[PDB]
Write a protein that binds this DNA or RNA. Structure first.
Ligand SMILES: [Mg+2]
Length: 577
DNA sequence: GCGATCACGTT
DNA sequence: GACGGACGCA
C-alpha cells in the first residue's frame, strides 16, 4: 500500500524519512537514478526521478541537513546526485554501514540481507528484482516502485533494532561519528576524481610494448617454437615436456608455472629468466597501463574510483575501477605508474602524507611492550632494532640479511602470515622460522603476551575489537581443523592491529577534512590507499599543508607511542616523495 | 555469456 | 595456510 505520486507534496518532505534514491548501474558515477521512494510518518511514496529531481521543494529537502534521512548505501545516492548537481544532506542513518559494523562477515549486499539480520523478510533481494549479468535490467514501473517502497519500508522499520544493537556493542558513535561522516568525505573524493596524464600512460605502454616484443622473440627462439606465453598450459608444455625441466610444484590441472617455481628453474635454462621478465612487463602493460586507461573518464580526464566502505573484515577501505591500492609499491617500474596521477588544475600540486609503521606502533600501544614502545619513543629504525635484539648484536654488526630477516618477522606481524608463511618468505624451514619467532618473543615478551591474550579473548567472547570498537567475530577459533583454526588465530591477533590502524586513518581523514574547511584552504582529499592520504592543492598552499597535514594526522588519536607521518609534495603522485 | 582456473599485485 | 587480467563449453 503506497502512493505512486505524479507530483511532490508537502507530506513527502517531513522532518524524518526513509529515502531510496535507486541507482541500478554497478558503477554509479554519472549513472541514471531509476526511481525514488520516501517513507515517513505521513505515508509511503514512489516518485519518478525526472519529476522529483526537477522539483525545487524536493531538491531543497534533499539538501537540508535538518531534514533527516535513513538510507542504505547513501554514498551511492550522494554521488549519483552530485553528477546531477544536487546535494544530499542530513543522512542520519545508513543501514549498510550499520550492518557492516554489527558483523562485517555477513557480506550485506542489499537491504534484504540487512533485513534478514532482524527477521524482516518483506523485501526482495536486489538480484531477484534486477537479475544478474546479461539479463540484468530495470523492471517495469509497478514492479520497480513496489521494490523501492519495500526497501524504504524496511529501512524505516530496521533503524531502531540496528541502533539498539550498535548501542549494546558500544558501536553507536562508531557509526554516527566515524563511518557516516567518512561516507560523505569519500563521496566528495570520488566525485572530485584524480586527473590522469593519459599521454604519459600511452607513452609507458609503448615502451612496454617494445620491450615485450623483444623478450617474446627471445622466448620463441629459446623454446624453438612460437606459443602463447600468456597461457600457463602452453608454457608448461614447453618447460616441462619440450625442455624437460624438473617439475617442482604441481597444480590441480597440470604443472605450476608460478614465479616462485620459475625462479627455482632459472639456473637450468635461459628461457626462464625471459619468461619472468615477460610476465612482469606483461602485467604492468595489461593490468596497470591498459587497465588504468580503460577507466579514465574521457569527459573529465580523471579516474573516479568507488570506495567500498563495507567490505573488509578489518575495517580498511577497498576500492575499484580503479583500485589504486593495488598498484605495486616497488619502484622497479611498478611505482612509476604513479607518475600518471597529476593535479587537476594548473599551478596545483599533489601533497602526499603517509603514516610510518602505524601498524607496529599500534601493536606497541595495545601490547604495552616495553621494548617496542621504547624503540618507537626513540624513533629507531624498527627493523634494524629488531635485528639487533634477535641476533644480540650491536647496530654496526647488523648485516643487510639480518635486517631483511627481522623485517620479514615484522612484516609477518603486520599482515598476519603464519610461520609457514614466514618460512616461505624467508626461504627457510618451518622449524627455523619457528625458532626465529621464539627469539623475537624473547626480545618482545609483551607482544607474545598480547598474542596469547587476544586469542584467549577471542575464544571467550567470540570476537575481537579495535581501538574504536570495530568487531570481528571468529567462530572458527576453536575449529578442530588445524588450518582453519590457525587462520582464525592469526585474524584474532591481526585484526586489532590492522583494524585499529584503519580506525586511526579514518579519523584522520575526518579531522583533516574539517581542518581544511576551518582554514579555508582549497586543498582537497583525493585518495586514501595503504597508510597514505593523497591531496591536491594550489602550489600557494604547500607550505601551510606541510605543517597542517602531519599535525592533524599525528594528533588523530593519542597512543602510548608517537604517531609518525612522512609527507612530500610534487608535480605527480610519484614525485610527491 | 558463464564457470573453472591460473597468475600476480595488494591485504 | 580474500580482494581485484587472461580455456571449454554452450
Ligand atoms: Mg606499514
Amino acid at each position: 500500500a503506497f502512493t505512486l505520486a505524479d507530483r511532490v507534496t508537502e507530506e513527502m518532505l517531513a522532518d524524518k524519512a526513509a529515502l531510496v534514491v535507486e541507482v541500478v548501474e554497478e558503477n554509479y558515477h554519472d549513472a541514471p537514478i531509476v526511481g525514488i521512494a520516501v517513507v515517513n510518518e505521513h505515508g509511503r511514496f514512489f516518485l519518478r526521478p525526472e519529476t522529483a529531481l526537477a522539483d525545487p521543494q524536493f531538491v531543497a529537502w534533499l539538501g537540508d541537513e535538518t531534514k533527516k534521512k535513513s538510507m542504505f548505501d547513501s554514498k551511492r545516492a550522494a554521488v549519483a546526485l552530485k553528477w546531477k548537481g544536487i546535494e544530499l544532506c542530513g543522512v542520519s542513518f545508513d543501514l549498510l554501514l550499520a550492518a557492516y559494523l554489527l558483523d562485517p562477515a555477513q557480506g550485506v549486499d542489499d537491504v534484504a540481507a540487512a533485513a534478514k539480520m532482524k527477521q524482516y523478510e518483506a523485501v526482495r533481494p536486489d538480484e531477484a528484482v534486477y537479475g544478474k549479468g546479461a539479463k540484468r535490467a530495470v523492471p517495469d514501473e509497478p514492479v520497480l516502485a513496489e521494490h523501492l517502497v519495500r526497501k524504504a519500508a524496511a529501512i524505516w522499520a530496521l533503524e531502531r533494532p540496528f541502533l539498539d544493537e550498535l548501542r549494546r556493542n558500544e558501536q553507536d558513535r562508531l557509526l554516527v561519528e566515524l563511518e557516516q561522516p567518512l561516507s560523505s568525505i569519500l563521496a566528495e573524493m570520488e566525485f572530485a576524481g584524480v586527473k590522469v596524464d593519459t599521454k604519459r600512460l600511452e607513452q609507458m605502454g609503448e615502451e612496454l610494448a617494445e620491450q615485450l616484443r623483444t623478450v617474446e622473440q627471445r622466448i620463441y627462439e629459446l623454446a624453438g617454437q612460437e606459443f602463447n606465453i600468456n597461457s600457463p598450459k602452453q608454457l608448461g608444455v614447453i618447460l616441462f615436456e619440450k625442455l624437460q625441466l624438473p617439475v617442482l610444484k604441481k597444480t590441480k590441472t597440470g604443472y605450476s608455472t608460478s614465479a616462485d617455481v620459475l625462479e627455482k628453474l632459472a639456473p637450468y635454462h635461459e628461457i626462464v629468466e625471459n619468461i619472468l621478465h615477460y610476465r612482469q612487463l606483461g602485467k604492468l602493460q595489461s593490468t596497470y597501463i591498459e587497465g588504468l586507461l580503460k577507466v579514465v573518464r574521457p569527459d573529465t580526464k580523471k579516474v573516479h574510483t568507488i570506495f567500498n566502505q563495507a567490505l573488509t573484515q578489518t575495517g580498511r577501505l577497498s576500492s575499484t575501477e580503479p583500485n589504486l591500492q593495488n598498484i605495486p609499491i616497488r619502484l622497479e617500474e611498478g611505482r612509476k605508474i604513479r607518475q600518471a596521477f597529476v593535479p587537476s588544475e594548473s599551478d596545483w600540486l599533489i601533497f602526499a602524507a603517509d603514516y610510518s609503521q602505524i601498524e607496529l606502533r599500534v601493536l606497541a600501544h595495545i601490547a604495552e611492550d616495553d621494548n617496542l614502545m621504547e624503540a618507537f619513543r626513540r624513533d629507531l629504525d624498527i627493523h634494524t632494532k629488531t635485528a639487533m635484539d634477535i641476533f644480540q648484536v650491536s647496530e654496526d654488526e647488523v648485516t643487510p640479511n639480518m635486517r631483511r630477516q627481522a623485517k620479514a618477522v615484522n612484516f609477518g606481524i603486520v599482515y598476519g602470515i603464519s610461520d609457514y608463511g614466514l618460512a616461505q618468505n624467508l626461504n627457510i624451514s618451518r622449524k627455523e622460522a619457528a625458532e626465529f619467532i621464539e627469539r623475537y618473543f624473547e626480545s618482545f615478551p609483551g607482544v607474545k603476551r598480547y598474542m596469547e591474550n587476544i586469542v584467549q579473548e577471542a575464544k571467550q567472547k567470540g570476537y575481537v575489537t579495535t581501538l574504536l570498537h570495530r568487531r570481528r567475530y571468529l567462530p572458527d577459533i576453536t575449529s578442530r581443523n588445524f588450518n582453519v583454526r590457525s587462520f582464525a588465530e592469526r585474524m584474532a591477533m591481526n585484526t586489532p592491529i590492522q583494524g585499529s590502524a584503519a580506525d586511526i586513518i579514518k579519523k584522520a581523514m575526518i579531522d583533516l577534512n574539517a581542518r581544511l574547511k576551518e582554514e579555508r584552504l582549497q586543498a582537497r582529499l583525493l585518495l586514501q590507499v595503504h597508510d597514505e592520504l593523497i591531496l591536491e592543492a594550489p602550489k600557494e598552499e604547500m607550505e601551510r599543508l606541510c605543517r597542517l597535514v602531519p599535525e592533524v594526522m599525528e594528533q588523530a588519536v593519542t597512543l602510548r607511542v608517537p604517531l609518525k607521518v612522512d609527507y612530500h609534495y610534487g608535480s605527480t603522485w610519484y614525485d610527491a616523495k
